[PDB]
Amino acid sequence: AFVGLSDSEEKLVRDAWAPIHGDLQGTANTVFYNYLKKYPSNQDKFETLKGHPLDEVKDTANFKLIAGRIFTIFDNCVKNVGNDKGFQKVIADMSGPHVARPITHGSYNDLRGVIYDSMHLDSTHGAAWNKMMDNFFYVFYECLDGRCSQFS
Ligand code: HEM
């Protein structure tokens, strides 16, 4: 389900993300590398990376484009944490190209964990961060299964 956050929880989310916000491309490159290294089955999902050793593709503009675009979305969700409909819209618009793509909830959840582990959050910030991410994944999965118009 979608469960709204308090203004304190909204604030904890912004604070949690702030080191990443100030280094979005850098952090994105590292997390995306770490995700494809830990969960290598996912690399084939990207036609542009398919068939290359990960270490050969990690320094390409294209790899960094892919990693950066993920982080831009989360940046925009964090910016919209206080606006349910605007947070939902960010997700709705990015969900479209993932629809009917053969990516499991497991592969998405695996990326979520790599992001989490990278942030080294204390439990107060982690709790607020997980409320936001639970909302993100609720919206995202509803949209993947053709129930996106509900958030309009
Ligand atoms: C859950 C966090 C994610 C976010 C915020 C995100 C975001 C985006 C964005 C903004 C785009 C660009 C427009 C588009 O083509 O959709 C995109 C495309 C794409 N997404 Fe993701 N995505 C996520 C997860 C994933 C995962 C885990 C996979 C694969 C195991 C994946 C596979 C793809 C592929 C294959 C494309 C097109 C690739 C290209 O040729 O450049 N996405 N995504």
Structure description:
There is one protein chain. The chain has 152 residues and is mostly helical. Helix content is 67%, strand content 0%. It contains seven helices and no strands. Helix 2 (24-38) packs across helix 6 (105-119) and helix 5 packs across helix 7. The radius of gyration is 15 Å and the shape is globular. Protoporphyrin IX containing FE binds at residues 42, 45-48, 66, 69-70, 73, 94, 97-98, 103, 107-108, 111.
What attributes characterize this protein structure?
monomer, 152 residues, mainly alpha, Globin-like, binds protoporphyrin IX containing FE, oxygen transport, hemoglobin
Based on the coordinates given, report the CATH architecture: Orthogonal Bundle
The structural class is mainly alpha
Identify every distinct bound molecule in the structure, by name, code or SMILES.
protoporphyrin IX containing FE
**Helical residue percent?**
55-70%
Number of domains: 1
CATH superfamily: Globins
Helices, by number, come to 7
- What radius of gyration results from the CA coordinates? 15 Å
Order of helices and strands: HHHHHHH
Strand content: under 5%
Give the gist of this structure.
The PDB classes it as oxygen transport. By secondary structure, the chain is mainly α.
Please write out the topology.
Elements: H1 7-21, H2 24-38, H3 54-57, H4 61-79, H5 84-95, H6 105-119, H7 123-144
Helix pairs in contact: 1-7, 2-4, 2-6, 4-5, 5-7
Organism: Tokunagayusurika akamusi
Binding site for heme b 1: 48, 98, 101
Binding site for heme b 3: 98
